[PDB]
Amino acid sequence: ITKDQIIEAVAAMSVMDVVELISAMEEKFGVSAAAAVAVAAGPVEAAEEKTEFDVILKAAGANKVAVIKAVRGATGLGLKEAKDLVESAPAALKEGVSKDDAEALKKALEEAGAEVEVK
Amino acid sequence: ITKDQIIEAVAAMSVMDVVELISAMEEKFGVSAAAAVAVAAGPVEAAEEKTEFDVILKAAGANKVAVIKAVRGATGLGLKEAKDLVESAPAALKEGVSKDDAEALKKALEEAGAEVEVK
Amino acid sequence: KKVQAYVKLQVAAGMANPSPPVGPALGQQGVNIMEFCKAFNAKTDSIEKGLPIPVVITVYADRSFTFVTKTPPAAVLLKKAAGIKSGSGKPNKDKVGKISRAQLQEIAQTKAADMTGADIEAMTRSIEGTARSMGLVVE
RNA sequence: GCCCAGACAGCCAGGAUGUUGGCUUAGAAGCAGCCAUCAUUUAAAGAAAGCGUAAUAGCUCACUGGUCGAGUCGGCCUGC
Protein backbone atom coordinates (compact mmCIF):
# COMPACT_ATOMS: atom_id res chain seq x y z
CA ILE A 1 0.00 0.00 0.00
CA THR A 2 1.06 3.62 -0.51
CA LYS A 3 3.36 4.95 2.21
CA ASP A 4 0.99 7.87 2.75
CA GLN A 5 -1.87 5.37 3.00
CA ILE A 6 0.07 3.41 5.62
CA ILE A 7 0.67 6.58 7.63
CA GLU A 8 -3.06 7.34 7.64
CA ALA A 9 -3.89 3.74 8.52
CA VAL A 10 -1.65 3.90 11.60
CA ALA A 11 -3.31 7.15 12.68
CA ALA A 12 -6.69 5.40 12.59
CA MET A 13 -5.50 2.28 14.41
CA SER A 14 -6.13 2.47 18.15
CA VAL A 15 -2.91 2.59 20.17
CA MET A 16 -3.73 -1.02 21.03
CA ASP A 17 -3.60 -1.84 17.33
CA VAL A 18 -0.18 -0.20 17.07
CA VAL A 19 1.46 -1.60 20.22
CA GLU A 20 1.20 -5.27 19.35
CA LEU A 21 2.19 -4.00 15.90
CA ILE A 22 5.60 -2.64 16.91
CA SER A 23 6.22 -5.68 19.11
CA ALA A 24 5.24 -7.69 16.05
CA MET A 25 7.88 -6.07 13.84
CA GLU A 26 10.24 -6.71 16.75
CA GLU A 27 9.88 -10.48 16.36
CA LYS A 28 10.91 -10.56 12.70
CA PHE A 29 13.20 -7.64 11.85
CA GLY A 30 14.26 -7.58 15.48
CA VAL A 31 14.50 -4.91 18.18
CA SER A 32 17.13 -3.23 15.99
CA ALA A 33 15.35 -3.04 12.63
CA ALA A 34 11.90 -2.75 14.20
CA ALA A 35 13.16 0.11 16.37
CA ALA A 36 12.29 2.54 13.58
CA VAL A 37 8.56 1.83 13.66
CA ALA A 38 8.57 1.28 17.43
CA VAL A 39 9.86 4.78 18.17
CA ALA A 40 7.64 6.37 15.51
CA ALA A 41 4.49 4.47 16.46
CA GLY A 42 4.61 5.28 20.16
CA PRO A 43 3.99 9.02 19.50
CA VAL A 44 0.30 8.21 18.98
CA GLU A 45 -0.25 11.10 21.42
CA ALA A 46 -2.50 8.85 23.50
CA ALA A 47 -0.53 10.07 26.50
CA GLU A 48 0.28 13.54 25.16
CA GLU A 49 -3.46 14.18 24.79
CA LYS A 50 -4.64 13.01 28.22
CA THR A 51 -7.39 11.06 26.46
CA GLU A 52 -10.72 8.69 23.54
CA PHE A 53 -11.36 2.96 25.99
CA ASP A 54 -11.59 3.22 29.77
CA VAL A 55 -14.10 3.48 32.61
CA ILE A 56 -13.58 6.80 34.41
CA LEU A 57 -15.25 7.11 37.81
CA LYS A 58 -16.43 10.73 37.96
CA ALA A 59 -18.62 9.83 40.94
CA ALA A 60 -19.57 6.51 42.53
CA GLY A 61 -22.22 6.80 45.24
CA ALA A 62 -21.83 7.71 48.92
CA ASN A 63 -21.10 4.07 49.82
CA LYS A 64 -17.99 2.10 48.88
CA VAL A 65 -18.99 -1.54 48.79
CA ALA A 66 -21.48 -1.37 45.90
CA VAL A 67 -18.95 0.60 43.86
CA ILE A 68 -15.90 -1.22 45.19
CA LYS A 69 -17.72 -4.56 44.92
CA ALA A 70 -18.01 -3.98 41.18
CA VAL A 71 -14.41 -2.78 41.23
CA ARG A 72 -13.33 -5.83 43.24
CA GLY A 73 -15.25 -8.05 40.85
CA ALA A 74 -13.88 -6.31 37.77
CA THR A 75 -10.31 -5.88 39.03
CA GLY A 76 -9.97 -8.29 41.95
CA LEU A 77 -8.89 -6.53 45.15
CA GLY A 78 -8.94 -7.16 48.94
CA LEU A 79 -9.15 -4.32 51.55
CA LYS A 80 -6.37 -1.65 50.36
CA GLU A 81 -6.36 -2.21 46.40
CA ALA A 82 -9.96 -0.66 45.64
CA LYS A 83 -10.12 1.32 49.13
CA ASP A 84 -7.25 3.98 48.58
CA LEU A 85 -7.76 4.98 44.81
CA VAL A 86 -11.35 4.10 43.66
CA GLU A 87 -12.58 7.08 45.66
CA SER A 88 -10.59 10.04 44.38
CA ALA A 89 -11.62 7.53 41.79
CA PRO A 90 -8.37 6.96 39.86
CA ALA A 91 -10.82 6.27 37.06
CA ALA A 92 -8.41 3.63 35.78
CA LEU A 93 -10.94 1.06 36.99
CA LYS A 94 -9.73 -0.97 34.03
CA GLU A 95 -7.59 -0.40 30.94
CA GLY A 96 -7.33 -1.57 27.35
CA VAL A 97 -11.02 -2.44 27.06
CA SER A 98 -13.19 -2.24 23.94
CA LYS A 99 -16.12 0.15 23.55
CA ASP A 100 -18.61 -2.58 24.48
CA ASP A 101 -16.64 -3.85 27.48
CA ALA A 102 -16.04 -0.30 28.67
CA GLU A 103 -19.75 0.31 28.14
CA ALA A 104 -20.66 -2.82 30.09
CA LEU A 105 -18.29 -1.91 32.91
CA LYS A 106 -19.82 1.57 33.07
CA LYS A 107 -23.26 -0.01 33.38
CA ALA A 108 -22.28 -2.29 36.27
CA LEU A 109 -20.78 0.69 38.09
CA GLU A 110 -23.77 2.92 37.33
CA GLU A 111 -25.97 0.16 38.73
CA ALA A 112 -23.96 0.44 41.93
CA GLY A 113 -24.61 4.13 41.40
CA ALA A 114 -21.25 5.22 40.01
CA GLU A 115 -21.29 8.27 37.75
CA VAL A 116 -18.85 7.00 35.13
CA GLU A 117 -17.54 8.72 32.00
CA VAL A 118 -16.06 6.65 29.17
CA LYS A 119 -13.01 8.15 27.48
CA ILE B 1 -13.42 28.41 33.55
CA THR B 2 -16.42 26.21 32.72
CA LYS B 3 -16.29 22.72 34.24
CA ASP B 4 -16.83 21.23 30.78
CA GLN B 5 -14.03 23.46 29.50
CA ILE B 6 -11.78 22.18 32.28
CA ILE B 7 -12.60 18.58 31.38
CA GLU B 8 -11.63 19.24 27.76
CA ALA B 9 -8.60 21.24 28.86
CA VAL B 10 -7.43 18.31 30.98
CA ALA B 11 -8.05 15.95 28.06
CA ALA B 12 -5.53 18.02 26.10
CA MET B 13 -2.46 18.23 28.34
CA SER B 14 0.45 15.77 28.16
CA VAL B 15 1.48 13.15 30.73
CA MET B 16 4.03 15.55 32.21
CA ASP B 17 1.47 18.36 32.49
CA VAL B 18 -1.17 16.43 34.45
CA VAL B 19 1.45 15.03 36.83
CA GLU B 20 2.34 18.67 37.47
CA LEU B 21 -1.30 19.55 38.08
CA ILE B 22 -2.13 16.63 40.37
CA SER B 23 1.07 17.34 42.29
CA ALA B 24 0.29 21.04 42.62
CA MET B 25 -3.19 20.13 43.86
CA GLU B 26 -1.67 17.73 46.39
CA GLU B 27 0.59 20.45 47.79
CA LYS B 28 -2.28 22.94 47.94
CA PHE B 29 -5.30 20.81 48.86
CA GLY B 30 -3.67 17.68 50.24
CA VAL B 31 -3.52 13.92 49.70
CA SER B 32 -7.09 13.83 51.04
CA ALA B 33 -8.61 16.85 49.30
CA ALA B 34 -6.42 16.95 46.18
CA ALA B 35 -7.32 13.28 45.90
CA ALA B 36 -10.44 14.18 43.90
CA VAL B 37 -8.14 15.40 41.12
CA ALA B 38 -5.14 13.06 41.13
CA VAL B 39 -7.85 10.78 39.78
CA ALA B 40 -9.51 12.07 36.61
CA ALA B 41 -5.88 12.55 35.65
CA GLY B 42 -4.30 9.09 35.80
CA PRO B 43 -6.77 7.49 33.30
CA VAL B 44 -5.10 9.53 30.55
CA GLU B 45 -4.91 6.22 28.67
CA ALA B 46 -1.14 6.37 28.22
CA ALA B 47 -0.97 2.74 29.31
CA GLU B 48 -4.66 1.95 28.75
CA GLU B 49 -4.01 2.38 25.04
CA LYS B 50 -0.46 1.15 25.61
CA THR B 51 1.74 -4.03 27.86
CA GLU B 52 -2.96 -8.33 25.41
CA PHE B 53 -2.86 -10.84 20.84
CA ASP B 54 -4.05 -11.24 17.24
CA VAL B 55 -2.15 -11.33 13.94
CA ILE B 56 -3.18 -9.03 11.08
CA LEU B 57 -1.75 -8.75 7.58
CA LYS B 58 -0.94 -5.19 6.47
CA ALA B 59 0.37 -6.33 3.09
CA ALA B 60 1.62 -9.48 1.37
CA GLY B 61 4.02 -7.64 -0.91
CA ALA B 62 5.14 -9.23 -4.17
CA ASN B 63 5.31 -12.70 -2.63
CA LYS B 64 1.57 -13.35 -2.42
CA VAL B 65 2.04 -17.08 -2.97
CA ALA B 66 4.73 -17.19 -0.29
CA VAL B 67 2.54 -15.37 2.23
CA ILE B 68 -0.38 -17.66 1.38
CA LYS B 69 1.80 -20.68 2.12
CA ALA B 70 2.49 -19.43 5.65
CA VAL B 71 -1.20 -18.66 6.14
CA ARG B 72 -2.24 -22.10 4.89
CA GLY B 73 0.21 -23.62 7.36
CA ALA B 74 -0.82 -21.57 10.39
CA THR B 75 -4.58 -21.40 9.84
CA GLY B 76 -4.88 -24.58 7.80
CA LEU B 77 -7.34 -22.92 5.43
CA GLY B 78 -7.65 -24.15 1.86
CA LEU B 79 -6.03 -22.46 -1.13
CA LYS B 80 -9.13 -20.45 -2.04
CA GLU B 81 -9.80 -19.47 1.58
CA ALA B 82 -6.16 -18.53 2.16
CA LYS B 83 -5.66 -16.35 -0.92
CA ASP B 84 -8.96 -14.62 -0.11
CA LEU B 85 -7.60 -13.74 3.33
CA VAL B 86 -4.30 -12.53 1.86
CA GLU B 87 -5.40 -10.49 -1.16
CA SER B 88 -7.90 -8.07 0.37
CA ALA B 89 -5.79 -8.46 3.51
CA PRO B 90 -8.85 -8.97 5.79
CA ALA B 91 -6.41 -8.50 8.68
CA ALA B 92 -7.13 -11.12 11.36
CA LEU B 93 -4.86 -14.04 10.46
CA LYS B 94 -5.58 -15.62 13.85
CA GLU B 95 -6.58 -14.26 17.25
CA GLY B 96 -6.78 -15.48 20.83
CA VAL B 97 -3.09 -16.39 20.85
CA SER B 98 -0.57 -15.31 23.50
CA LYS B 99 2.20 -12.74 23.09
CA ASP B 100 4.90 -15.23 22.14
CA ASP B 101 2.55 -17.07 19.78
CA ALA B 102 1.16 -13.98 18.05
CA GLU B 103 4.79 -12.86 18.08
CA ALA B 104 6.28 -15.99 16.51
CA LEU B 105 3.32 -16.22 14.13
CA LYS B 106 4.45 -13.05 12.37
CA LYS B 107 7.96 -14.50 12.46
CA ALA B 108 6.57 -16.79 9.76
CA LEU B 109 4.72 -14.20 7.67
CA GLU B 110 7.19 -11.37 7.04
CA GLU B 111 9.79 -13.98 6.09
CA ALA B 112 7.50 -14.74 3.16
CA GLY B 113 7.77 -11.04 2.39
CA ALA B 114 4.63 -9.70 4.06
CA GLU B 115 4.09 -6.70 6.32
CA VAL B 116 2.10 -7.85 9.35
CA GLU B 117 0.37 -6.05 12.24
CA VAL B 118 -0.89 -7.34 15.58
CA LYS B 119 -3.69 -5.58 17.50
CA LYS C 1 -39.91 -18.66 37.80
CA LYS C 2 -39.42 -14.97 38.57
CA VAL C 3 -39.92 -15.40 42.31
CA GLN C 4 -36.57 -15.99 44.02
CA ALA C 5 -34.96 -15.17 47.36
CA TYR C 6 -31.35 -15.66 48.46
CA VAL C 7 -29.60 -15.75 51.84
CA LYS C 8 -28.03 -18.25 54.26
CA LEU C 9 -25.28 -18.40 56.90
CA GLN C 10 -23.17 -20.62 59.17
CA VAL C 11 -25.15 -23.59 60.50
CA ALA C 12 -23.65 -26.05 62.99
CA ALA C 13 -23.13 -29.35 61.18
CA GLY C 14 -25.96 -31.36 62.70
CA MET C 15 -28.29 -28.76 64.20
CA ALA C 16 -31.38 -27.45 62.40
CA ASN C 17 -34.80 -27.53 64.09
CA PRO C 18 -36.71 -26.54 66.02
CA SER C 19 -38.14 -23.23 64.86
CA PRO C 20 -35.78 -21.06 66.85
CA PRO C 21 -33.31 -20.20 65.58
CA VAL C 22 -34.18 -21.69 62.18
CA GLY C 23 -37.96 -21.65 61.78
CA PRO C 24 -39.97 -18.85 60.10
CA ALA C 25 -36.54 -17.95 58.71
CA LEU C 26 -36.13 -19.31 55.18
CA GLY C 27 -39.47 -20.87 56.06
CA GLN C 28 -41.63 -17.95 54.98
CA GLN C 29 -39.62 -17.29 51.83
CA GLY C 30 -40.88 -20.34 49.96
CA VAL C 31 -38.90 -23.22 51.45
CA ASN C 32 -40.05 -25.23 54.48
CA ILE C 33 -37.93 -26.35 57.44
CA MET C 34 -39.45 -29.85 57.41
CA GLU C 35 -36.96 -31.37 54.99
CA PHE C 36 -33.92 -29.32 54.01
CA CYS C 37 -32.98 -30.37 57.55
CA LYS C 38 -32.10 -33.98 56.76
CA ALA C 39 -30.87 -32.40 53.53
CA PHE C 40 -28.06 -30.68 55.42
CA ASN C 41 -27.08 -33.12 58.17
CA ALA C 42 -26.86 -35.88 55.57
CA LYS C 43 -24.31 -34.22 53.30
CA THR C 44 -22.19 -32.62 56.01
CA ASP C 45 -21.29 -36.04 57.38
CA SER C 46 -17.65 -37.21 57.36
CA ILE C 47 -16.25 -33.86 58.48
CA GLU C 48 -15.95 -32.21 61.90
CA LYS C 49 -19.18 -32.30 63.91
CA GLY C 50 -18.10 -29.02 65.45
CA LEU C 51 -17.73 -27.02 62.25
CA PRO C 52 -20.08 -24.02 61.70
CA ILE C 53 -19.77 -24.08 57.90
CA PRO C 54 -22.01 -21.57 56.03
CA VAL C 55 -23.71 -23.46 53.20
CA VAL C 56 -24.96 -21.17 50.43
CA ILE C 57 -28.65 -21.76 49.77
CA THR C 58 -30.96 -20.06 47.29
CA VAL C 59 -34.71 -20.50 47.81
CA TYR C 60 -37.24 -21.56 45.18
CA ALA C 61 -39.23 -21.13 41.98
CA ASP C 62 -41.55 -23.99 42.86
CA ARG C 63 -41.42 -24.87 46.57
CA SER C 64 -38.12 -26.72 46.99
CA PHE C 65 -34.63 -25.42 47.76
CA THR C 66 -30.95 -26.00 46.94
CA PHE C 67 -27.62 -26.81 48.64
CA VAL C 68 -23.87 -26.16 48.38
CA THR C 69 -21.50 -26.85 51.29
CA LYS C 70 -18.50 -24.59 50.74
CA THR C 71 -15.39 -24.34 52.92
CA PRO C 72 -13.78 -23.32 57.91
CA PRO C 73 -10.90 -23.91 57.93
CA ALA C 74 -11.16 -20.18 58.73
CA ALA C 75 -12.88 -19.05 61.95
CA VAL C 76 -12.32 -22.50 63.42
CA LEU C 77 -8.75 -23.44 64.37
CA LEU C 78 -8.68 -19.71 65.12
CA LYS C 79 -10.90 -20.22 68.15
CA LYS C 80 -9.38 -23.67 68.63
CA ALA C 81 -5.91 -22.12 68.68
CA ALA C 82 -6.36 -20.38 72.02
CA GLY C 83 -9.09 -22.24 73.88
CA ILE C 84 -12.53 -22.13 72.28
CA LYS C 85 -14.37 -23.49 75.32
CA SER C 86 -12.77 -21.34 78.03
CA GLY C 87 -12.46 -17.73 76.91
CA SER C 88 -11.81 -14.40 78.61
CA GLY C 89 -14.86 -12.34 79.53
CA LYS C 90 -12.83 -9.22 78.82
CA PRO C 91 -10.23 -9.84 76.04
CA ASN C 92 -7.24 -7.45 76.07
CA LYS C 93 -6.87 -7.72 79.83
CA ASP C 94 -5.51 -11.27 79.92
CA LYS C 95 -4.62 -14.12 77.56
CA VAL C 96 -5.98 -17.59 76.78
CA GLY C 97 -3.57 -19.19 74.34
CA LYS C 98 -0.59 -18.58 72.07
CA ILE C 99 0.43 -19.07 68.43
CA SER C 100 3.77 -19.10 66.59
CA ARG C 101 4.67 -17.20 63.43
CA ALA C 102 4.38 -20.42 61.42
CA GLN C 103 0.81 -20.98 62.58
CA LEU C 104 0.16 -17.36 61.59
CA GLN C 105 0.79 -17.90 57.89
CA GLU C 106 -0.95 -21.25 58.29
CA ILE C 107 -4.48 -20.01 58.97
CA ALA C 108 -3.38 -17.55 56.29
CA GLN C 109 -3.47 -18.44 52.59
CA THR C 110 -5.94 -21.15 53.63
CA LYS C 111 -8.79 -18.65 53.23
CA ALA C 112 -7.36 -16.27 50.63
CA ALA C 113 -10.45 -17.25 48.66
CA ASP C 114 -12.78 -15.19 50.88
CA MET C 115 -10.19 -13.18 52.76
CA THR C 116 -9.23 -10.28 50.54
CA GLY C 117 -5.75 -8.84 50.03
CA ALA C 118 -2.64 -8.74 47.85
CA ASP C 119 0.78 -9.90 49.07
CA ILE C 120 1.10 -12.50 51.83
CA GLU C 121 2.29 -9.86 54.30
CA ALA C 122 -1.06 -8.15 53.81
CA MET C 123 -2.69 -11.51 54.52
CA THR C 124 -0.51 -12.20 57.56
CA ARG C 125 -2.05 -8.99 58.85
CA SER C 126 -5.79 -8.27 59.09
CA ILE C 127 -5.81 -11.75 60.62
CA GLU C 128 -3.48 -9.92 63.00
CA GLY C 129 -6.18 -7.27 63.08
CA THR C 130 -8.52 -10.15 63.80
CA ALA C 131 -5.51 -11.22 65.86
CA ARG C 132 -7.18 -10.96 69.22
CA SER C 133 -10.12 -9.26 70.85
CA MET C 134 -10.58 -12.71 72.33
CA GLY C 135 -7.67 -13.47 74.66
CA LEU C 136 -4.80 -15.06 72.69
CA VAL C 137 -1.50 -13.17 72.52
CA VAL C 138 0.13 -11.98 69.29
CA GLU C 139 3.47 -13.68 69.96
C1' G D 1 -14.24 31.38 64.98
C1' C D 2 -16.11 29.90 60.32
C1' C D 3 -17.36 32.39 54.62
C1' C D 4 -17.64 32.39 47.10
C1' A D 5 -11.69 25.29 47.02
C1' G D 6 -20.99 26.50 46.83
C1' A D 7 -20.33 24.08 52.14
C1' C D 8 -24.76 23.02 55.82
C1' A D 9 -29.77 20.94 54.81
C1' G D 10 -33.04 18.51 49.98
C1' C D 11 -33.22 14.62 45.55
C1' C D 12 -30.39 10.25 42.94
C1' A D 13 -27.39 6.22 44.08
C1' G D 14 -25.09 4.21 47.17
C1' G D 15 -23.98 2.13 54.11
C1' A D 16 -19.35 -2.87 52.97
C1' U D 17 -14.91 -7.48 53.74
C1' G D 18 -12.53 -10.91 57.66
C1' U D 19 -17.18 -11.20 60.93
C1' U D 20 -22.92 -13.81 62.96
C1' G D 21 -15.49 -9.84 66.96
C1' G D 22 -15.59 -12.55 71.41
C1' C D 23 -17.93 -14.09 75.60
C1' U D 24 -22.50 -15.30 77.06
C1' U D 25 -27.11 -17.04 75.65
C1' A D 26 -32.55 -21.80 74.05
C1' G D 27 -31.25 -17.83 70.17
C1' A D 28 -28.53 -12.65 70.15
C1' A D 29 -25.61 -12.61 63.64
C1' G D 30 -23.96 -3.58 64.46
C1' C D 31 -28.64 -2.93 67.61
C1' A D 32 -30.65 -8.29 75.64
C1' G D 33 -26.26 -8.20 78.52
C1' C D 34 -20.71 -8.62 79.44
C1' C D 35 -15.75 -6.82 76.91
C1' A D 36 -13.11 -4.85 73.59
C1' U D 37 -13.93 -1.69 69.05
C1' C D 38 -8.69 -3.72 65.29
C1' A D 39 -7.59 -4.48 60.07
C1' U D 40 -7.85 -5.58 55.58
C1' U D 41 -10.84 -2.83 49.58
C1' U D 42 -11.82 3.55 48.47
C1' A D 43 -14.00 10.34 47.30
C1' A D 44 -16.73 7.65 52.09
C1' A D 45 -19.05 2.87 55.77
C1' G D 46 -18.81 3.56 63.40
C1' A D 47 -17.09 -4.43 64.12
C1' A D 48 -22.21 0.44 64.03
C1' A D 49 -26.36 6.10 66.19
C1' G D 50 -32.17 4.29 65.72
C1' C D 51 -36.74 1.37 63.77
C1' G D 52 -37.35 -3.79 63.07
C1' U D 53 -36.84 -10.02 63.83
C1' A D 54 -38.06 -15.43 68.11
C1' A D 55 -32.93 -15.09 66.26
C1' U D 56 -32.00 -13.63 60.57
C1' A D 57 -33.89 -10.48 56.97
C1' G D 58 -35.49 -5.61 55.75
C1' C D 59 -35.38 -0.11 56.49
C1' U D 60 -32.67 4.56 57.99
C1' C D 61 -28.20 7.38 60.23
C1' A D 62 -23.09 8.40 60.62
C1' C D 63 -19.21 8.98 56.30
C1' U D 64 -18.37 10.66 51.33
C1' G D 65 -19.93 12.26 45.23
C1' G D 66 -23.40 13.98 41.88
C1' U D 67 -27.11 17.20 41.44
C1' C D 68 -29.81 21.60 44.25
C1' G D 69 -27.05 26.92 45.54
C1' A D 70 -24.95 32.15 50.06
C1' G D 71 -23.15 33.93 54.59
C1' U D 72 -23.19 30.73 58.46
C1' C D 73 -22.07 28.84 63.19
C1' G D 74 -20.40 28.80 68.55
C1' G D 75 -20.30 32.20 72.56
C1' C D 76 -20.43 36.74 76.12
C1' C D 77 -23.32 41.16 77.63
C1' U D 78 -27.21 44.74 77.88
C1' G D 79 -32.44 47.45 77.25
C1' C D 80 -37.67 46.60 77.23
Swiss-Prot record, chains A, B:
The organism's place on the tree of life at top rank: Bacteria
Residue segments, region Required for recruitment of EF-Tu and EF-G, and for EF-Tu and EF-G-promoted GTP hydrolysis: 52-119
Keywords (A to Z) from UniProt: Acetylation, Methylation, Ribonucleoprotein, Ribosomal protein
Post-translational modification as stated in the protein's UniProt record: Lys-80 was found to be 50% monomethylated.
Modification N6-methyllysine, positions: K80
A GO CC term assigned to this protein in UniProt: cytosolic large ribosomal subunit
GO terms of biological process kind: cytoplasmic translation; translation
Gene Ontology molecular-function annotations: mRNA binding; protein homodimerization activity; ribosome binding; structural constituent of ribosome
Physiological role: The binding site for several of the GTPase factors involved in protein synthesis (IF-2, EF-Tu, EF-G and RF3). Is thus essential for accurate translation. Deletion of 1 of the L12 dimers from the ribosome (by deleting the binding site on L10) leads to decreased IF-2 association with the 70S ribosome and decreased stimulation of the GTPase activity of EF-G.
HAMAP family, per database record: Ribosomal_bL12
Other comments on record: Ribosomal protein L8 appears to be an aggregate of ribosomal proteins L7/L12 and L10.
Quaternary state and interactors: Homodimer. Part of the 50S ribosomal subunit; present in 4 copies per ribosome. L7/L12 forms dimers with an elongated shape. Two dimers associate with a copy of L10 to form part of the ribosomal stalk (called L8). The ribosomal stalk helps the ribosome interact with GTP-bound translation factors. Forms a pentameric L10(L12)2(L12)2 complex, where L10 forms an elongated spine to which 2 L12 dimers bind in a sequential fashion.
Family membership: Belongs to the bacterial ribosomal protein bL12 family.
Record protein name field: Large ribosomal subunit protein bL12
From Swiss-Prot, chain C:
Modified residues (N6-succinyllysine): K70, K79
Gene3D superfamilies according to UniProt: Ribosomal protein L11, C-terminal domain, Ribosomal protein L11/L12, N-terminal domain
UniProt modified residues of type N6,N6,N6-trimethyllysine: K2, K38
An example Gene Ontology CC term for this record: cytosolic large ribosomal subunit
Xref: Pfam families: Ribosomal_L11 (PF00298), Ribosomal_L11_N (PF03946)
UniProt-listed GO biological process terms: cytoplasmic translation; ribosomal large subunit assembly; stringent response; translation; translational termination
Domain of life the protein comes from: Bacteria
Keyword annotations from UniProtKB, A to Z: Methylation, Ribonucleoprotein, Ribosomal protein, RNA-binding, rRNA-binding
Gene Ontology MF: a single term: rRNA binding
InterPro entries noted in UniProt: Ribosomal_uL11, Ribosomal_uL11_bac-typ, Ribosomal_uL11_C, Ribosomal_uL11_C_sf, Ribosomal_uL11_CS, Ribosomal_uL11_N, Ribosomal_uL11_N_sf
Family recorded in the similarity comment: Belongs to the universal ribosomal protein uL11 family.
PANTHER family: 60S RIBOSOMAL PROTEIN L12, LARGE RIBOSOMAL SUBUNIT PROTEIN UL11M
Record's function text: Forms part of the ribosomal stalk which helps the ribosome interact with GTP-bound translation factors.
HAMAP family linked: Ribosomal_uL11
Subunit structure: Part of the ribosomal stalk of the 50S ribosomal subunit. Interacts with L10 and the large rRNA to form the base of the stalk. L10 forms an elongated spine to which 2 L12 dimers bind in a sequential fashion forming a pentameric L10(L12)2(L12)2 complex.
Name of the protein this chain belongs to: Large ribosomal subunit protein uL11
Source organism of the structure: Escherichia coli (strain K12)
High-level lineage: Bacteria, Pseudomonadati, Pseudomonadota, Gammaproteobacteria, Enterobacterales
